Amino acid sequence: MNLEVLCGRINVENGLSLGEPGLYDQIYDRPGLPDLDVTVDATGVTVDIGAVPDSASQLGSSINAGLITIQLSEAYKINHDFTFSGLSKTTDRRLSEVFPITHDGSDGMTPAVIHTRLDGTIVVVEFSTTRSHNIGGLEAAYRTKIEKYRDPISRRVDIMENPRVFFGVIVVSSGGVLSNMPLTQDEAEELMYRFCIANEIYTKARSMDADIELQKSEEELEAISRALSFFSLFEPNIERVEGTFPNSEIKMLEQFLSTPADVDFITKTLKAKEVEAYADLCDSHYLKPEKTIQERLEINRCEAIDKTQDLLAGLHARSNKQTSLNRGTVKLPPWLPKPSSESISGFGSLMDHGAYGELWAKCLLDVSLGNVEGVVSDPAKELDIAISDYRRFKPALSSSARQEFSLQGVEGKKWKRMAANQKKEKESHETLSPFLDVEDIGDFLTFNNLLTDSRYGDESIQRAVSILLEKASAMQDTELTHALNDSFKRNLSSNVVQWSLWVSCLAQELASALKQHCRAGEFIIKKLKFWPIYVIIKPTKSSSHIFYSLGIRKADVTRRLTGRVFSDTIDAGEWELTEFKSLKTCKLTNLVNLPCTMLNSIAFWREKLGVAPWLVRKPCSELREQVGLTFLISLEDKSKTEEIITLTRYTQMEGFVSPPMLPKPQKMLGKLDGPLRTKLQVYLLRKHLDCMVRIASQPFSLIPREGRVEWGGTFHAISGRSTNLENMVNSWYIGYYKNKEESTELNALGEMYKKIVEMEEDKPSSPEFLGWGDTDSPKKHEFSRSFLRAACSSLEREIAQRHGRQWKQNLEERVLREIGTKNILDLASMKATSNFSKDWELYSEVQTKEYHRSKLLEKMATLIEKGVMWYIDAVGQAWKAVLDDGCMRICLFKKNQHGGLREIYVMDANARLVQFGVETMARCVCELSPHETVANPRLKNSIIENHGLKSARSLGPGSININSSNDAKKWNQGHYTTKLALVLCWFMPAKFHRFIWAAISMFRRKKMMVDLRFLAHLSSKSESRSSDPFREAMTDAFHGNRDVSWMDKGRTYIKTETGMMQGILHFTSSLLHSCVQSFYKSYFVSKLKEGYMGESISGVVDVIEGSDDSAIMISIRPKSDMDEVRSRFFVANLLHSVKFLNPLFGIYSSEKSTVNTVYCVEYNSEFHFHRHLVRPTLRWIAASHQISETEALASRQEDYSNLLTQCLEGGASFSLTYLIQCAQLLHHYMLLGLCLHPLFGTFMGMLISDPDPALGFFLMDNPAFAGGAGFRFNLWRACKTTDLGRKYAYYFNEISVMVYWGDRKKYQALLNRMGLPEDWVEQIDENPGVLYRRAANKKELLLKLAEKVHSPGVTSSLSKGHVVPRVVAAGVYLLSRHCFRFSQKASLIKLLMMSSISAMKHGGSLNPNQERMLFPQAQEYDRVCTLLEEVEHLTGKFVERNIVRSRIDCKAEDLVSEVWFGLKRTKLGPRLLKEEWDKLRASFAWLSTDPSETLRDGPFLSHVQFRNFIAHVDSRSVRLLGAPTTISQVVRMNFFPGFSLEKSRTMTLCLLSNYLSSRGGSILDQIERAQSGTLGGFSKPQKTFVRPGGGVGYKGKGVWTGVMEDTHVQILIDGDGTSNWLEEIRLSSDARLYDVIESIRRLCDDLGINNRVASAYRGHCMVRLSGFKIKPASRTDGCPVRIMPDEVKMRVRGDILNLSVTIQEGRVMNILSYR
RNA sequence: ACACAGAGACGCCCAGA
RNA sequence: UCUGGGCGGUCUUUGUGU
């Protein structure tokens, strides 16, 4: 309506004013809604408006009741345009036209109505519209708009004299209209009615997928616009880029894009590599001349024997050549005493039994003469501290004793220069000969007494564990849990676990003593709390060695562990003593975790051999061998020890190689080099050599049975005993029992510097093979441009075929959106960033200063403080800094892995911002690839599974499948970082090239810090005498005696030009490997088409690729016996030619690859053996004890639950899950101070009073469904069935026990460097909308940063390695010194008494309101709890080798945000919105539309707690392994292997029974929640005028929108009065196209639909669908298959079962009715 | 004792003889 | 080379992705 009257009524007097916000609610009565007929075209959406329904209150003058139309591009403002079009005047002007330019960057955006004709003013009446149901969101919108538009106007005020400006804001919502210019109630009513009718139009229009998936709002368009503006105005100064980085000319990119691939070179090179591969495969694999398989195997065995003997001779020639040595693998005594109690006759016989005897006697004399206090803590003294709220001796050791101790490292620094110490040091470096006699290790492994019963079931430690386990099982006390508990007791009464108990106690007590220091000659003596073993301890410091000597009376040792693998013990008169041994912080974790490790090992290797936990059987040879091997690996904890058994997987996968090809296990002799320093290493190496000889002698026998393919003849990697396939795969994985987190000494940092340099120094001198020309015999780091063009074109063809034509525009828009939506804060994280700069280059200046890495969060917050809020506004500054620097800065360390040796690089702050854009670009490009899995996880378990279906469909029954599991070597340093730029720039638009090329061109000069301490100890070592050229290379490179290109005179860095870094260009290299795999796929299809005699071989080829590990799968069908051999030969040639085709692409095939394997593939350690999927369970079983350093006590339990779930999903039965949860309980209580605190039993007794998990109680899963339910499920069960619910209800009615680690010394400092305000809580409270959205301004980003830094995740992120020793070192004072915090400092005994004195003031239970508030998922918890009583006793039968994968399965966050702030986040319409909000109000009565009303009248003081509450309100799904009512089936099948415990038609019958019985609520919602589909209806009801039509109406238009099989089915329908036909069809999920088509046709024929009329649309399309049949997407005719609430009458028909779902016309549609 | 085809660690900072 | 004392979320130490 009129604007001049609205403008002229205001009068400006002095200057700029904001006005007064007037709020006008609904005052006058409102009519209904006019009749609206909306139709969506291919170019616009148009509305016909009917008569206004009886405007008795003069409301509706603005509407015209005629015809209106809008565009698709203008549709997203369908409210903001149509509501406000009466006041809209076409101006297209900015204030910059009427005000002089102040150069503030505000000269381009039109700010809505800016009517100027009032005495020379500008008003800028700027407009808005919201869906808020309250005032708080309206106030937030007003504040956001005024903050957006206030500052530039005030900046532009002062340019002219006497300003007259008067800015204003209008906001319209359903609840009312708030403004600031003078407005009367009538036009406010008009605007609100226009808003209601426009919202109705928008609701009708939201049944169109062109608008549902349209751009959300102006935020996405503005992000795309700013990204476009940055990308079109970014000058990287390319001449400088060429001047400072090598190989940075644009001409490489121009010639790659312009000059096509030379077909003649490709044709010549392919036949050259084909004949080379044929010659190599004949020569190496013995085909010329012709021979049988047997003699081929014998001569391959001869080659293997010769190669192993050559390696043995080479290792023996560099050793000390000794065939006998007395060395113990386990350096701990074999004592297994009987612990009784605290027990602190010729004490002179120890003096003359050596130096250790002298020390022990002169210590025990001080013990007897001195004070008992100090050795152990008195219970009374510790109890006197909690309620009321170390022994050191200096013996005069002799010179001989001091020298003997210094020989073993005790005070060895002072006696370094003596002759004996120097001789010991010289002999220490000697390598052991491989021919050393190690028969004792094999004798111990084969025969031992580790699993024999120890008979201490009535022991106090076992009594404590038993009572705690009985209390944990008291709430579930049935027969099955009792049987498995008794089995755990038997596993706790073995000899090995009883030895491990006192060993773990010693390790934990050493970890406690690691923080103590002693003077020269002082020692610390203690007694084990249970066992009568005395420990003498020499502490140096925490980061150095701890020394210990053990002593025990000869009468207290009841029995010993058999075997000669133990170190010699000194035999004195009445005591047995052990020499001084050393440990470190890293080595203690394995010894702490020892009894749990043995318990889990016994459980796993007991069930894997087929004996039940509840059966009694004597241990066999192989079980003892596996347990002893695990014991020795855990006790030794050395990298070279586990490397040999790690390589056994790659060695033993070669036994699956099919003819014609021989097994090649002797290719791994290259990685088996290196010195051997222990007897166990020698034994493992010889067993590995024997395994290679046995593998080369005979392959694994692949037997085709009646319905499945099986493998026989498989055997253990080390012990060599014949076992099953699963046992072999698991035995490949015993080497991960070593700790990941191994502290690396400085002397090992040099050798890991080799891999950076040893491949850099061989850079080719000519860069004309680095991307310029073509080469048929390429050196490493070189590649062919033509081959890269061919592979890139092949992947381009694949992407265009899969995602339709003009896909580059979609890729451009998604890349622009992804870049624009990124802010500064998302890249801020608690990951380490480098601090290396130009000031750190010269060692002559940084010799004293020590280098510390900073946090990325701190630097990103520093950039936030400087007024940088968007990501694109920092990349330019980062590139300016990097280009001025001239190089990219990197700092290194070592990865704490198991698979080998690996260096890890860390960027500075500048390079990360540049790398992030390229990373997102490459990820978005790889998302289009149909065989890339790094960005598409769903393809990991899809391509392998669907290959069988494709082979069955295309080739039919009887298909031979041949696989190749390729792995690349040196994936990072091999790729010269010009290939990746070319590959990325092939797929990207033309205007994005000049940033992609630059950002990747900075990887060609890498500037890497080396360790400063390494430089300090190398500077004073200018003379080197090592038998390795790299050591002297480092020495004279640092000292400048020679010239190298990778280190200069006195520089703290190394230069690296060739190669990328690890994972830094992960997605781009994934794209490159996808291109290579696509080229190989096309080439393989071509060769299978051209045949071998000219007759084609009918076969299917598909490839999968990740980062460097790929797999090629080829299924072929021979037609005869003679054809099969030739076809297998041809396929073997094709799969072998990749090893020579890869160097043309610069990829080097490793010896880790297993080529030409039938019915077997490995991709990501996921071994697919035909229809039997194999996972290594031992990795997750060994992963069940590393926990994160957390502050709350229950968080330890939830971490244990997470690790337990990880162990369950790896393929473990529920019995192992229960047993390893028992071991987790034991581990948690030992960390609580079970073996280090005198006051545990009383603590134990106090847990009689209260089983509170927050106070230190461990909850246990139900043994039938253990691991699959979280910790919160156990908490819920305990609250319902025990008295814990009373305590929780009392605590809630009154208104958790958490401990600070280091009292937040670092955290607070991390706060103080940021400078964040301490008053941010009220700023969050006053604008509730700062969350639930992303960001809009600098202040809200700062507030979100302050919210991020005050989070549990960032709190539990400053923890360092060796978490278990640091946790257990606090176990001596966790109970009896004030360390916990309650919701000041108080000991946990005090917390238990405070809980106990309030236990008398307890009553009732948890009402439904509190348990719904606290325990949000209670419904499915009860549903899964009520499905467990059907099987409760050990009743069943023994009847598994068919293990496959199985899976077991609006929300309030969107609802609250939409209601309170009007942000579109829900699919549901207004009716369902009101219904869901009413249900949420029924859930919590304190909720209200006003945010302030909910804040003030709620239990949360500020909005952040409310936000975390809503986040915690909002599904748990678990993946298992087993054979192919579902819950009952998987529980019955997955309890124990081979043992049973006592479209889907069945689901359709269940739904029908529910419909006839009406057990639940709406049957439509029950069907939808059951994942069945077929729910929806019309939105244009096919307008019906008169009967003469074909069904009265059925003419003109019509759309059916609904959900079937989780899709957005939006079938367009149209009739001409004589027939009805579909027009366009849209689908969301393309999982099962054929079943969806069948269901669609079945729905269609019930109403009557013809597909004769094809279409009128020839645009973008993925599949074109003719009549009831799939056709090619663009051939002819068809229709464009496109990928992007009331129940009144369910009557039935006759003679057929029917469900009347008649939506808007007299025809019945069927859901699942049928006959 | 740990690390290593001999680079390290086996204590480190403080005023006093 | 001795004398007194002080020393822990110490440092080493943890990157790119899923």
Ligand SMILES: O=c1ccn([C@@H]2O[C@H](COP(=O)(O)NP(=O)(O)OP(=O)(O)O)[C@@H](O)[C@H]2O)c(=O)[nH]1
């Ligand atoms: O922790 C990791 C592990 C793997 N990766 C990335 O994944 C790649 C493959 O991981 P990889 O174990 O195969 N190492 P690679 O350099 O290929 O040599 P090799 O072990 O002999 O085959 C590596 O080259 C890294 O780029 C990481 O970035 N971080």
Ligand SMILES: [Mg+2]
């Ligand atoms: Mg690899």
